[PDB]
Amino acid sequence: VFSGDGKDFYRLSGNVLSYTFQVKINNDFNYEFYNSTWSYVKHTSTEHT
Amino acid sequence: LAWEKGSSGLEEKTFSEWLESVKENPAVIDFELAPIVDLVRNIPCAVTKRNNLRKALQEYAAKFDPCQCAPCPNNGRPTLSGTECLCVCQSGTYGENCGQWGCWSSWSTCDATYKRSRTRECN
Amino acid sequence: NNPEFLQLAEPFWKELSHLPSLYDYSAYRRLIDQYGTHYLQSGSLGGE
Amino acid sequence: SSFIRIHKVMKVLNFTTKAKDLHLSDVFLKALNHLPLEYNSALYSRIF
Amino acid sequence: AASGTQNNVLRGEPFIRGAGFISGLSYLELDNPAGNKRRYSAWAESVTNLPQVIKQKLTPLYELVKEVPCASVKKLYLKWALEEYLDEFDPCHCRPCQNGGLATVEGTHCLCHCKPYTFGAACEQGVLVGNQAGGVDGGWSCWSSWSPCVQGKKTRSRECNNPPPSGGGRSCVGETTESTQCEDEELEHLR
Amino acid sequence: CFCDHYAWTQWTSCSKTCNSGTQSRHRQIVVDKYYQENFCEQICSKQETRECNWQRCPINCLLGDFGPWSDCDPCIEKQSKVRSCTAPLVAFQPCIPSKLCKIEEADCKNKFRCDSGRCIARKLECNGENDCGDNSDERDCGRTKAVCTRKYNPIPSVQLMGNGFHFLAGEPRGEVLDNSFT
Ligand SMILES: *[C@@H]1O[C@H](CO)[C@@H](O[C@@H]2O[C@H](CO)[C@@H](O)[C@H](O)[C@H]2NC(C)=O)[C@H](O)[C@H]1NC(C)=O
């Protein structure tokens, strides 16, 4: 078997029926970004004379 | 390129390297077909086992057909591999399970003439 | 190719030959534990 | 919000198999000789 | 009076499966969520240079018994032994695990393999993030007593059991009953 | 506004088991002062819908009962039994052959017979090239005729040009044609 994605030559066998040199690759990306915030302010004043 | 896909932004730098890699090692995409029974020609008893292989292929096509598999969500082509049916996802579809011809009919009774028919439905 | 005279391994063939003719679950359990339950039919070597 | 997708195909070198006098492989011709003479759909489906 | 509480429970468990180049992208985890491009290409080359045999297709192992002393008798006995092995430690005996956990049998002990982002004794704690639809799926029960071979068929008739579909999940996929031809010493062991 | 003041409810059950599911959640909106005095109604989403179990409903693989035993006349005493999953599709067992092997003959008539079974032309013998596959032709060749002046490299991805194609399986097949023979 010739050079496929490797060294000069490989060696097959009688029991092995096939050696294949087809390239396929799958990828995935699932990015999620969250950011919450809270800001509460309360003030009171009372003066009597 | 597959790893950089996460930040693609329509990248083109690694596209030339991918072109070179495919030039070094392509993959089967398009192809014309022909019956494998025509390849056995130089064996001791060629015609006998050739006709036997034709009969075996006829009976195998009668046994297994793509119509036996359940249909696919969006125009997918189901294929039978062993005892499972996988849907071939086309461009624009994804997922583990992503008109088509139906099943053939039973062979009608052999008429007085040679003419025997079988019908398939596009349902 | 699965259907053929596949050259078996020395330990596998030796354990299969040392199996008793009469049904004995003892050695059968140990052979199944050591060698498994299934052999390879097809499949690529895709990473993960 | 936005979403973009592309798809491209490469038309790399052709391939043309010769019509006649094709040279079979070792394992294929080996398995092709173990076929029974009388018709047998089961053993013929194996090489299929 | 001023009171403040801070809690940042951030964790991860990458599964990177090339022997040597495993450590790189997995240990890059500190303050670097995204993996390096060149390191990813190096790991891709390495895992190309070393197989990743997982993701296989299977066939019955007992079929490999072809040319040995007492070949067919040993093959049939291995079929029976494989059936007994499969139904002796079938995870059906194990009780259903919490939060949709998957149970296994290692010897004589059940192990609830916890789903991602879960932990505990029976995968009960750590319900902070599910990221799935939710519910409780169905599970097939253990196979009942085998048929007495009245006409060769089987009467296992796997039915629902103590883990029924309750949280709105889908039922256990699979056949209800099975049917085959009884061996009966396989026609007195092949003529 | 702070849309998180009304936390989302838990995702409801999937509407169907396998075909197609629909689940939704809504804000726990209470009409308080903060809601009305910050225009929280027009800007905060009140529901989120998403699919669940978007796969299909594959039917259970159902085989059929065995058929009648088939008579055997091959060179290897094995009988076939075909039925229409995890159980084997077809299981072959030893047979009781009424007739053993026959019609044994030499395939090669005007060509050379390689010891491996391949039948190649006698012209391909003693040419300094492995044509049988197991170096049978070049076994004891006293002299060879140089067919090529220099050792050249083979075509890349040439083995994919010899593989068979199973139309039903979606994965073409193992090797059937040899791509090293020249
Ligand atoms: C948290 O909120 C910030 C908004 O301030 C998000 O990103 C910030 O973007 C600005 C843009 O210049 C940077 O200067 C800040 O450093 C960023 N925030 C941080 C914490 O670095 C951010 O995406 C939000 N989500 C997170 C941090 O998970």
XYZ file of C-alpha atoms and ligand atoms in Angstrom:
669
model
C 0.000 0.000 0.000
C 1.380 3.368 -1.099
C 2.120 6.470 0.983
C -1.137 7.761 2.424
C -0.950 10.506 5.069
C 2.178 8.893 6.484
C 5.571 7.372 5.705
C 6.894 6.057 2.385
C 5.121 2.687 2.365
C 3.024 0.428 4.582
C 2.324 -3.305 4.346
C -1.158 -4.824 4.230
C -2.293 -8.389 4.952
C -4.511 -11.094 3.519
C -6.928 -10.975 6.450
C -7.331 -7.195 6.195
C -9.634 -6.470 3.264
C -9.013 -2.755 2.746
C -6.921 0.254 3.699
C -8.463 3.631 2.911
C -6.964 7.111 2.517
C -10.026 9.378 2.665
C -9.974 12.390 4.998
C -13.035 13.519 6.951
C -13.241 15.446 10.225
C -16.132 16.924 12.210
C -16.047 19.869 14.614
C -18.446 21.689 16.925
C -18.584 24.944 18.891
C -21.377 25.939 21.299
C -20.403 29.181 23.045
C -22.709 30.818 25.590
C -22.159 34.115 27.417
C -24.328 35.567 30.194
C -23.829 38.487 32.568
C -26.507 39.827 34.923
C -26.356 42.929 37.108
C -28.240 44.425 40.053
C -28.168 47.976 41.414
C -30.722 49.212 43.957
C -30.390 52.421 45.984
C -32.834 53.775 48.571
C -32.508 56.846 50.788
C -34.843 58.636 53.193
C -34.568 61.709 55.407
C -36.936 63.311 57.913
C -36.338 66.401 60.054
C -38.840 68.173 62.306
C -38.391 71.112 64.674
C -8.918 24.887 9.423
C -11.476 22.797 11.323
C -10.101 24.111 14.619
C -9.922 27.709 13.358
C -13.570 27.430 12.245
C -14.521 28.605 15.745
C -13.262 32.057 14.688
C -13.869 31.753 10.939
C -14.926 35.290 9.938
C -14.678 33.938 6.363
C -11.001 33.088 6.728
C -8.866 32.366 3.665
C -5.267 32.018 4.919
C -5.413 28.280 5.647
C -7.547 27.760 2.526
C -4.436 27.481 0.343
C -2.904 24.938 2.727
C -6.151 22.953 2.627
C -6.104 23.089 -1.182
C -2.547 21.733 -1.155
C -3.531 18.988 1.297
C -6.488 17.941 -0.868
C -4.173 17.956 -3.890
C -1.958 15.582 -1.903
C -4.918 13.430 -0.766
C -8.380 13.794 -2.340
C -11.571 11.977 -1.363
C -14.178 10.189 -3.470
C -17.011 12.640 -4.214
C -18.472 11.877 -7.670
C -18.385 8.600 -9.577
C -20.136 6.474 -12.181
C -21.183 2.910 -11.401
C -21.333 -0.489 -13.094
C -22.367 -3.967 -11.897
C -19.656 -5.800 -9.971
C -20.709 -9.058 -11.661
C -18.839 -7.911 -14.793
C -15.509 -7.984 -12.910
C -15.346 -11.782 -12.494
C -14.088 -12.773 -15.945
C -10.786 -14.628 -15.445
C -11.744 -17.435 -13.048
C -11.934 -21.160 -13.985
C -15.756 -21.279 -14.277
C -16.691 -17.707 -15.172
C -20.163 -17.885 -16.734
C -21.640 -20.295 -14.168
C -20.721 -18.344 -11.039
C -21.403 -15.110 -12.947
C -25.030 -16.116 -13.519
C -25.161 -17.357 -9.923
C -23.912 -13.950 -8.755
C -26.521 -12.203 -10.907
C -29.254 -14.329 -9.319
C -27.822 -13.627 -5.860
C -27.839 -9.888 -6.581
C -31.447 -10.080 -7.781
C -32.493 -11.890 -4.601
C -30.495 -9.468 -2.433
C -32.168 -6.468 -4.073
C -35.494 -8.216 -3.468
C -34.487 -8.679 0.180
C -32.948 -5.275 0.976
C -34.176 -1.980 -0.492
C -33.903 1.683 0.551
C -37.709 1.888 0.717
C -37.688 -0.503 3.690
C -35.990 2.216 5.743
C -38.136 4.881 7.364
C -38.196 8.288 5.632
C -35.997 11.184 6.698
C -37.027 14.549 8.197
C -36.042 16.905 5.338
C -35.642 15.211 1.931
C -32.892 12.942 3.251
C -31.822 9.766 1.486
C -32.029 6.792 3.890
C -29.430 4.056 3.441
C -29.458 0.518 4.842
C -26.211 -0.610 6.500
C -26.607 -3.972 8.210
C -29.699 -3.753 10.422
C -29.799 0.044 10.860
C -31.066 2.847 8.618
C -29.065 6.086 8.529
C -30.194 9.283 6.807
C -27.693 11.013 4.524
C -27.743 14.692 5.479
C -27.604 17.109 2.548
C -26.108 20.595 2.478
C -27.910 22.730 5.047
C -29.033 19.922 7.375
C -27.492 18.412 10.501
C -28.320 16.134 13.417
C -27.817 12.450 14.129
C -30.846 11.541 11.973
C -30.866 14.615 9.692
C -39.371 12.620 -3.628
C -38.087 9.071 -3.183
C -39.107 5.803 -4.804
C -41.230 3.315 -2.890
C -41.033 -0.443 -2.572
C -41.317 -2.732 -5.568
C -44.349 -4.955 -6.018
C -44.448 -8.739 -5.990
C -43.562 -10.493 -9.231
C -46.786 -11.140 -11.121
C -47.631 -14.630 -12.326
C -45.592 -15.683 -15.355
C -47.909 -15.072 -18.305
C -48.246 -17.324 -21.344
C -45.766 -15.012 -23.077
C -42.307 -14.110 -21.771
C -43.631 -10.761 -20.521
C -43.485 -10.558 -16.718
C -43.694 -7.177 -15.016
C -42.790 -5.470 -11.750
C -43.836 -1.959 -10.743
C -42.345 0.633 -8.396
C -44.210 3.636 -6.991
C -42.860 7.166 -6.513
C -44.665 7.663 -3.212
C -12.925 -9.623 5.490
C -14.858 -11.489 8.184
C -15.831 -14.782 6.432
C -12.512 -16.562 5.781
C -9.932 -18.721 7.549
C -8.834 -15.847 9.755
C -5.521 -16.637 11.444
C -6.419 -16.807 15.127
C -4.101 -15.686 17.906
C -2.006 -18.041 20.017
C -3.797 -17.283 23.338
C -7.251 -17.186 21.731
C -6.796 -20.463 19.849
C -5.163 -22.093 22.880
C -8.031 -21.125 25.192
C -10.593 -22.220 22.592
C -8.845 -25.598 22.298
C -8.600 -26.034 26.082
C -12.386 -25.672 26.330
C -14.142 -28.891 27.395
C -16.361 -30.685 24.904
C -19.256 -30.897 27.366
C -20.978 -27.623 28.255
C -19.126 -26.025 31.192
C -19.970 -22.411 32.030
C -16.865 -22.034 34.226
C -14.231 -21.736 31.490
C -16.724 -20.094 29.119
C -17.235 -17.243 31.593
C -13.487 -16.665 31.958
C -12.909 -16.728 28.194
C -15.741 -14.244 27.612
C -14.340 -11.988 30.344
C -10.806 -12.096 28.930
C -11.686 -11.798 25.232
C -14.986 -9.895 25.285
C -18.283 -10.381 23.489
C -17.840 -9.056 19.925
C -15.236 -8.703 17.185
C -14.655 -6.012 14.578
C -16.828 -5.967 11.446
C -16.344 -2.436 10.087
C -15.698 1.136 11.126
C -13.169 3.923 10.663
C -10.674 5.157 13.269
C -12.204 8.603 13.813
C -10.799 10.623 16.694
C -12.688 12.385 19.450
C -27.993 39.086 15.527
C -26.508 37.425 12.453
C -25.739 34.043 10.909
C -23.717 33.082 7.823
C -22.906 29.789 6.117
C -20.920 28.755 3.036
C -20.260 25.585 1.049
C -17.607 24.774 -1.560
C -16.642 21.703 -3.593
C -13.316 20.892 -5.274
C -13.143 19.328 -8.743
C -9.820 17.547 -8.261
C -8.230 15.144 -10.788
C -10.512 12.697 -12.596
C -10.229 8.916 -12.593
C -10.938 6.545 -15.490
C -10.986 2.788 -14.918
C -10.103 0.652 -17.931
C -13.052 -1.105 -19.547
C -11.723 -4.660 -19.921
C -8.873 -6.860 -18.675
C -9.036 -5.443 -15.151
C -6.578 -7.013 -12.707
C -8.311 -8.261 -9.560
C -6.755 -8.221 -6.094
C -5.358 -11.078 -4.014
C -7.983 -11.296 -1.265
C -10.879 -10.797 -3.699
C -9.835 -13.604 -6.048
C -9.085 -15.756 -2.995
C -12.584 -15.244 -1.579
C -14.042 -15.560 -5.093
C -12.713 -19.140 -5.328
C -14.312 -20.395 -2.090
C -17.776 -19.839 -3.585
C -19.909 -22.987 -3.948
C -20.699 -24.320 -7.399
C -24.418 -24.751 -6.730
C -26.389 -21.564 -6.134
C -26.474 -20.454 -2.490
C -27.857 -16.993 -1.729
C -26.527 -16.929 1.845
C -22.853 -17.548 1.068
C -23.094 -15.357 -2.039
C -24.439 -12.450 0.032
C -21.238 -12.600 2.102
C -19.013 -11.503 -0.782
C -21.674 -8.919 -1.658
C -24.337 46.994 58.568
C -22.729 45.653 55.391
C -22.923 42.009 54.307
C -21.537 40.451 51.144
C -21.485 36.922 49.720
C -19.389 35.763 46.762
C -19.398 32.328 45.135
C -17.729 31.384 41.831
C -18.000 27.602 41.377
C -16.412 27.168 37.943
C -15.211 23.729 36.869
C -14.400 21.640 33.822
C -13.461 18.165 32.639
C -12.123 18.019 29.072
C -12.047 14.645 27.308
C -9.089 14.683 24.900
C -8.442 11.319 23.246
C -1.363 10.487 20.293
C -0.265 9.593 23.814
C 2.092 12.465 24.594
C 0.171 15.416 23.145
C -2.845 14.689 25.387
C -1.472 16.786 28.246
C -1.205 20.070 26.330
C -4.729 21.202 25.473
C -6.083 19.593 28.650
C -3.636 21.381 30.983
C -3.978 24.673 29.067
C -7.234 24.951 31.041
C -5.920 27.552 33.518
C -7.403 30.926 32.507
C -7.428 29.786 28.847
C -10.841 28.354 27.880
C -10.108 28.250 24.147
C -7.360 25.882 23.061
C -4.343 27.098 21.128
C -4.470 26.779 17.343
C -0.938 25.430 16.866
C -1.345 23.088 19.839
C -4.613 21.825 18.347
C -2.912 21.155 15.005
C -0.068 19.350 16.786
C -2.549 17.192 18.704
C -4.399 16.451 15.456
C -1.170 15.291 13.809
C -0.290 13.208 16.878
C -3.702 11.525 17.092
C -3.327 10.828 13.379
C 0.016 9.158 14.178
C -1.622 6.949 16.853
C -4.984 5.159 16.590
C -8.230 5.986 18.393
C -9.857 2.560 18.047
C -13.112 3.663 19.742
C -16.234 4.164 17.572
C -16.366 0.592 16.228
C -18.942 -1.696 14.666
C -19.435 -5.139 16.171
C -20.377 -8.691 15.219
C -20.973 -11.814 17.349
C -17.597 -13.032 18.586
C -18.602 -16.713 18.628
C -18.718 -16.703 14.811
C -14.897 -16.867 14.684
C -15.031 -20.529 15.796
C -14.444 -22.159 12.405
C -11.616 -24.749 12.371
C -10.975 -26.151 15.864
C -11.479 -29.519 17.567
C -15.213 -29.892 18.237
C -15.835 -26.663 16.337
C -19.625 -26.532 16.018
C -20.368 -27.951 19.478
C -18.052 -25.383 21.062
C -19.636 -22.659 18.916
C -23.154 -23.521 20.091
C -21.984 -23.772 23.701
C -20.303 -20.368 23.366
C -23.578 -18.984 22.001
C -25.394 -20.305 25.076
C -22.642 -19.007 27.373
C -22.746 -15.557 25.764
C -26.526 -15.421 26.194
C -26.166 -16.413 29.853
C -23.404 -13.829 30.336
C -25.521 -11.112 28.718
C -28.614 -11.822 30.816
C -26.809 -12.568 34.108
C -25.427 -9.046 34.683
C -27.843 -7.070 32.510
C -28.108 -3.577 34.097
C -31.866 -4.162 34.290
C -31.301 -5.733 37.719
C -29.840 -2.464 39.009
C -32.312 0.084 40.328
C -32.854 3.238 38.238
C -30.443 6.064 39.007
C -31.533 9.577 39.913
C -31.366 12.466 37.426
C -31.440 10.097 34.458
C -28.226 8.359 35.472
C -27.029 5.263 33.633
C -26.315 2.151 35.703
C -23.739 -0.548 34.981
C -22.705 -3.860 36.541
C -19.069 -4.428 37.547
C -18.993 -7.908 39.045
C -21.620 -7.869 41.804
C -22.025 -4.113 42.288
C -24.114 -1.457 40.550
C -22.459 1.820 39.538
C -24.603 4.821 38.569
C -22.519 6.521 35.891
C -23.440 10.145 36.541
C -24.503 12.357 33.659
C -22.330 15.421 32.955
C -22.447 18.171 35.594
C -23.698 15.718 38.247
C -22.233 13.792 41.175
C -23.168 12.103 44.443
C -23.931 8.602 45.649
C -26.746 7.955 43.146
C -26.234 11.045 40.955
C -28.613 13.080 43.123
C -26.504 16.119 44.051
C -25.229 18.771 41.666
C -28.422 19.704 39.828
C -27.202 23.271 39.170
C -27.134 22.879 35.372
C -29.025 20.311 33.318
C -28.713 21.861 29.838
C -31.155 19.218 28.531
C -34.914 18.850 28.145
C -35.311 16.903 31.393
C -37.603 14.223 32.729
C -37.242 10.520 33.460
C -36.866 8.100 30.556
C -38.061 4.500 30.484
C -36.035 1.360 31.068
C -36.617 -2.222 29.960
C -37.046 -4.800 32.708
C -35.085 -8.022 33.060
C -35.930 -10.885 30.724
C -38.406 -13.319 32.277
C -38.163 -17.117 32.274
C -37.310 -18.505 28.850
C -39.964 -20.291 26.821
C -40.407 -24.065 27.294
C -39.992 -24.542 23.506
C -43.575 -25.504 22.713
C -43.147 -24.604 19.026
C -39.647 -23.093 19.163
C -40.687 -19.504 19.884
C -39.604 -17.354 22.830
C -41.697 -15.955 25.684
C -39.340 -13.506 27.396
C -41.748 -10.581 26.824
C -39.748 -7.686 28.238
C -42.185 -5.250 29.862
C -42.157 -1.949 31.725
C -41.070 -1.902 35.360
C -40.334 0.250 38.443
C -38.773 3.068 36.330
C -41.809 4.137 34.274
C -41.945 7.268 32.097
C -42.886 9.940 34.646
C -41.008 13.162 33.882
C -42.417 13.270 30.364
C -39.481 11.490 28.744
C -39.732 8.946 25.966
C -40.337 5.288 26.745
C -37.684 2.593 26.446
C -37.125 1.835 22.758
C -37.157 -1.811 21.706
C -39.336 -4.816 20.938
C -41.939 -6.152 23.358
C -41.440 -9.882 22.695
C -38.995 -12.071 20.779
C -39.408 -15.154 18.608
C -36.950 -17.642 17.105
C -36.549 -21.399 16.585
C -35.529 -23.454 19.613
C -32.339 -25.474 19.266
C -33.434 -28.758 20.893
C -29.789 -29.857 20.803
C -29.707 -28.189 17.349
C -31.490 -31.004 15.494
C -29.682 -33.597 17.634
C -26.425 -31.694 17.007
C -26.283 -31.699 13.206
C -27.557 -35.106 12.074
C -34.964 47.173 33.192
C -33.947 44.086 35.182
C -35.695 41.251 33.358
C -34.099 38.782 35.802
C -36.249 40.081 38.679
C -38.910 37.644 37.413
C -36.949 34.402 37.162
C -37.730 31.973 34.360
C -39.865 28.973 35.237
C -38.603 25.433 34.745
C -38.746 24.012 31.230
C -41.978 22.087 30.742
C -42.165 18.475 29.605
C -41.394 17.618 25.991
C -44.636 17.748 24.013
C -43.983 14.424 22.251
C -41.674 11.487 22.876
C -39.572 11.172 19.716
C -41.186 12.885 16.698
C -41.063 16.559 17.705
C -41.280 18.293 21.071
C -42.129 21.823 22.178
C -41.311 23.257 25.604
C -41.593 26.810 26.895
C -40.965 28.895 30.001
C -42.271 32.301 31.047
C -41.246 35.121 33.360
C -42.861 35.140 36.811
C -44.074 38.682 36.195
C -45.824 40.496 39.047
C -47.198 43.992 38.399
C -45.314 45.983 41.034
C -43.978 49.550 41.069
C -40.619 48.521 39.583
C -42.383 46.873 36.630
C -44.513 49.866 35.639
C -42.007 52.634 36.429
C -39.235 51.188 34.219
C -41.100 50.127 31.036
C -40.215 46.508 31.840
C -43.202 45.242 29.822
C -42.154 46.340 26.324
C -38.472 45.378 26.599
C -38.413 42.123 28.615
C -39.264 38.928 26.757
C -42.189 37.078 28.333
C -41.596 33.582 26.916
C -38.880 31.392 25.405
C -39.724 28.404 23.203
C -37.321 25.724 21.992
C -37.539 22.239 20.526
C -36.807 18.964 22.306
C -36.129 15.465 20.953
C -35.740 16.614 17.350
C -34.753 13.119 16.161
C -37.011 10.679 14.317
C -38.880 7.617 15.656
C -36.936 4.647 14.242
C -38.988 1.463 14.207
C -37.669 -1.571 16.059
C -35.585 -3.932 13.933
C -37.893 -6.931 13.478
C -36.537 -10.147 11.973
C -38.565 -13.147 10.825
C -38.662 -16.857 11.540
C -36.120 -19.194 9.979
C -36.811 -20.873 6.661
C -36.401 -24.473 5.527
C -32.946 -26.017 5.461
C -31.192 -25.715 2.099
C -29.547 -28.701 0.431
C -25.767 -28.447 0.132
C -23.359 -29.470 -2.604
C -20.281 -27.232 -2.035
C -16.647 -28.218 -1.509
C -17.011 -27.317 2.202
C -19.746 -29.142 4.127
C -21.724 -26.115 5.310
C -25.474 -25.513 5.046
C -27.309 -22.199 4.765
C -30.312 -20.967 6.745
C -31.726 -17.535 5.883
C -34.299 -15.473 7.774
C -35.736 -12.027 7.096
C -30.895 -5.993 15.428
C -28.294 -7.955 17.393
C -29.012 -11.531 16.294
C -27.099 -12.780 13.227
C -28.886 -12.289 9.917
C -27.838 -15.655 8.447
C -26.182 -18.447 10.445
C -24.391 -21.244 8.592
C -23.807 -24.655 10.175
C -22.026 -27.850 9.096
C -23.967 -29.829 6.517
C -24.425 -33.472 5.570
C -23.285 -33.336 1.918
C -24.749 -35.943 -0.405
C -21.872 -35.048 -2.764
C -18.427 -33.706 -1.875
C -16.276 -31.317 -3.912
C -16.053 -31.853 -7.667
C -15.117 -30.169 -10.954
C -11.605 -29.446 -9.668
C -9.381 -28.271 -12.516
C -6.555 -25.890 -13.379
C -7.878 -22.455 -14.335
C -4.752 -21.476 -16.279
C -4.531 -22.986 -19.770
C -2.186 -20.740 -21.786
C -1.020 -18.525 -18.888
C 1.074 -18.876 -15.738
C -0.421 -20.202 -12.496
C 0.694 -18.349 -9.381
C 0.832 -20.466 -6.231
C -1.553 -18.019 -4.520
C -4.332 -18.777 -7.033
C -3.931 -15.764 -9.322
C -3.686 -16.508 -13.053
C -1.464 -14.062 -14.951
C 0.003 -14.146 -18.443
C 3.340 -15.900 -18.914
C 4.710 -12.718 -20.520
C 4.552 -11.086 -17.066
C 7.045 -13.656 -15.715
C 10.735 -12.848 -15.152
C 10.334 -9.088 -15.636
C 11.644 -7.822 -12.289
C 8.176 -6.993 -10.945
C 5.897 -8.719 -8.432
C 2.848 -9.515 -10.571
C 1.408 -12.521 -8.717
C 1.305 -10.568 -5.438
C 3.541 -12.959 -3.471
C 6.678 -12.706 -5.667
C 5.947 -16.096 -7.248
C 6.833 -15.077 -10.813
C 10.269 -13.715 -9.827
C 11.095 -16.729 -7.632
C 14.057 -18.235 -9.512
C 14.384 -16.044 -12.608
C 17.997 -16.345 -13.734
C 17.737 -13.186 -15.843
C 15.185 -10.380 -16.020
C 14.379 -7.731 -18.622
C 14.265 -4.176 -17.266
C 10.748 -2.939 -18.013
C 11.238 0.491 -16.385
C 14.504 2.417 -16.283
C 14.005 4.056 -12.875
C 11.894 3.392 -9.791
C 8.951 5.813 -9.812
C 6.501 6.692 -7.060
C 2.867 5.531 -7.217
C -0.130 7.804 -7.710
C -1.503 9.187 -4.417
C -5.015 8.128 -3.394
C -4.909 5.431 -6.081
C -6.335 2.735 -3.788
C -9.633 4.629 -3.536
C -9.881 4.156 -7.321
C -10.091 0.372 -6.879
C -12.509 -0.024 -3.976
C -15.959 -1.433 -4.628
C -19.150 0.539 -4.050
C -22.107 -0.890 -2.124
C -24.971 1.358 -3.223
C -27.169 0.318 -0.285
C -24.731 0.967 2.578
C -23.539 4.535 1.919
C -19.949 3.432 2.626
C -18.562 2.184 -0.680
C -16.726 -1.083 0.180
C -13.426 -2.762 0.927
C -10.781 -3.316 -1.722
C -11.818 -5.397 -4.737
C -9.434 -4.205 -7.475
C -5.657 -4.091 -7.090
C -4.028 -0.705 -7.714
C -0.401 -1.841 -7.332
C -0.349 -4.053 -10.434
C 1.108 -2.297 -13.476
C -19.860 40.735 31.696
O -20.126 42.073 31.359
C -19.157 42.688 30.489
C -19.715 44.066 30.198
O -18.966 45.079 30.853
C -18.893 41.855 29.214
O -17.694 42.213 28.524
C -16.857 43.341 28.893
O -16.481 44.026 27.689
C -15.700 45.210 27.899
C -15.500 45.848 26.544
O -14.347 46.677 26.528
C -14.389 44.836 28.579
O -13.635 46.018 28.825
C -14.676 44.117 29.890
O -13.453 43.688 30.479
C -15.593 42.914 29.663
N -15.944 42.304 30.935
C -15.100 41.543 31.643
C -15.625 41.011 32.940
O -13.963 41.299 31.253
C -18.802 40.350 29.467
O -18.929 39.643 28.239
C -19.887 39.887 30.433
N -19.847 38.441 30.668
C -18.880 37.692 31.237
C -17.640 38.393 31.721
O -19.008 36.477 31.355
